[PDB]
Amino acid sequence: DASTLGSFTGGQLRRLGSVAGLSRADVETYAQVLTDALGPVAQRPLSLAPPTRTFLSDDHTPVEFSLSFRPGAAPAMRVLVEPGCGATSLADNGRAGLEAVRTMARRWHFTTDALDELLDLFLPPAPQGPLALWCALELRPGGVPGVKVYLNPAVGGEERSAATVREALRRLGHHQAFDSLPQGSGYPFLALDLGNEPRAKVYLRHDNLTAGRAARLSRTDSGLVPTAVEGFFRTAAGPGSDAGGLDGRPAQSCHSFTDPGAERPSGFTLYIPVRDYVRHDGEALARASTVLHHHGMDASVLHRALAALTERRPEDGVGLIAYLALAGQRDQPPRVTAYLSSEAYTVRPPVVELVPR
Ligand SMILES: N[C@@H](Cc1c[nH]c2ccccc12)C(=O)O
Ligand SMILES: CC(C)=CCSP(=O)(O)OP(=O)(O)O
């Protein structure tokens, strides 16, 4: 009866899945997919120390959830997992991550050619942190997910990051796409969409980002306009804004290459780590709700999502809403995403009353 990482994150996937409008059938399928993806660490009691060598979340839970809101669309639920979590080495973590993805490929028969083209760059021997391989599953109605793989451009050291992204973009048929990207402080992730023509995603870190610099990271042909980017920045950041740049953990951007041979991105997303810029998740939830309303969408599902993940009041803690994102793509209205923490390792400490007190 003791909670495990599997039983705990499975329960969250089920409760958030129902909040998101998924059928009992699809919820069952996806809970089994998450248990399988976690591998042996699914059986780990939550009373044991976490895998402190997983970076995926602040409390080292190897699962994070997200709800993506598009105007007129059903909310889309995603889960991010590190399948190699609990491996004794980063090299073995990557090998277990790749084994998990190949098992998903055998199940749903999506193409892995694009991934195979990149493996020598991203899974070398003696890899460097902070990750080897993450997988995100879009929990699509019908039980066949969309699959995304996240890899580490800094695997050979930060100095080799730019060259690794440039070579990855070349091998995926986007030529010198690298030179299209704005200036960044680093290259935390390269991600591939895997399905039935790969969508390549380059992530940039932006230290001390300002509203003005944020507005200049994207172009017309990427789906967001400058005033929408600045408005999102100021709503999401609250205090950290208009003070010389965001002063907590950094903003990140994503640049999507979808057209074959295209050297320019079709998509742009800005991520703000709202957890570093609020008193508590009540404040994060109010700022998220403002952003959703501003882009013509209902917020009540996001309110229900927090109650599904945890018993605690939003106002009694921070970090449940980890990031907010504004996501652009050519010929689409903006998309708003809330990244939602599992907090499997963030518990109410035991009640032992001091008397006298
Ligand atoms: N927790 C890590 C990785 C991560 C998880 N979800 C994210 C969403 C956006 C950017 C990074 C992340 C970080 O803050 O860097
Ligand atoms: C950087 C990490 C780990 C997750 C954010 S990637 P994402 O959810 O924004 O990608 P999508 O464009 O929503 O498929």
Side-chain angles (χ1 to χ4, degrees), residues 34 55 74 126-127 138 143 150 184-185 224 253 277 282 304 306:
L34 174 62
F55 159 64
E138 176 175 2
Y150 301 77
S185 324
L224 295 180
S253 61
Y277 301 109
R304 289 182 256 144
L306 265 63

Side-chain angles (χ1 to χ4, degrees), residues 63-69 71-196 198-218 220-236:
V63 177
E64 188 184 77
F65 300 104
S66 69
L67 290 175
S68 199
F69 300 84
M77 187 180 161
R78 308 89 58 80
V79 60
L80 179 66
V81 63
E82 179 179 83
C85 177
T88 59
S89 70
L90 196 49
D92 283 357
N93 179 310
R95 288 181 64 220
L98 180 61
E99 291 173 344
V101 166
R102 288 208 196 286
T103 296
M104 291 172 191
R106 289 284 183 180
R107 174 164 184 169
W108 294 308
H109 313 112
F110 59 80
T111 186
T112 63
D113 280 13
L115 180 56
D116 282 353
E117 283 297 337
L118 305 184
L119 287 176
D120 59 296
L121 289 169
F122 290 107
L123 299 173
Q128 305 187 45
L131 75 158
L133 193 154
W134 299 342
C135 175
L137 304 168
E138 176 175 2
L139 307 190
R140 290 178 180 162
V144 183
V147 174
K148 278 203 70 45
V149 177
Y150 301 77
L151 306 165
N152 180 10
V155 60
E158 275 204 309
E159 227 327 291
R160 291 195 65 181
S161 293
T164 301
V165 167
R166 174 188 294 283
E167 177 64 5
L169 280 171
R170 184 195 67 75
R171 290 188 194 183
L172 298 170
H174 297 281
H175 300 92
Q176 293 321 290
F178 182 80
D179 298 317
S180 269
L181 298 169
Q183 173 167 33
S185 324
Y187 301 90
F189 308 107
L190 188 143
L192 282 186
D193 279 353
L194 301 180
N196 52 22
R199 172 164 167 266
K201 292 165 79 42
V202 183
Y203 294 76
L204 277 30
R205 185 183 91 230
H206 302 284
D207 298 346
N208 307 313
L209 186 66
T210 60
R213 193 176 312 116
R216 289 185 322 259
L217 290 175
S218 72
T220 44
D221 59 348
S222 71
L224 295 180
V225 301
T227 46
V229 174
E230 291 182 313
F232 165 67
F233 179 107
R234 294 189 227 250
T235 302

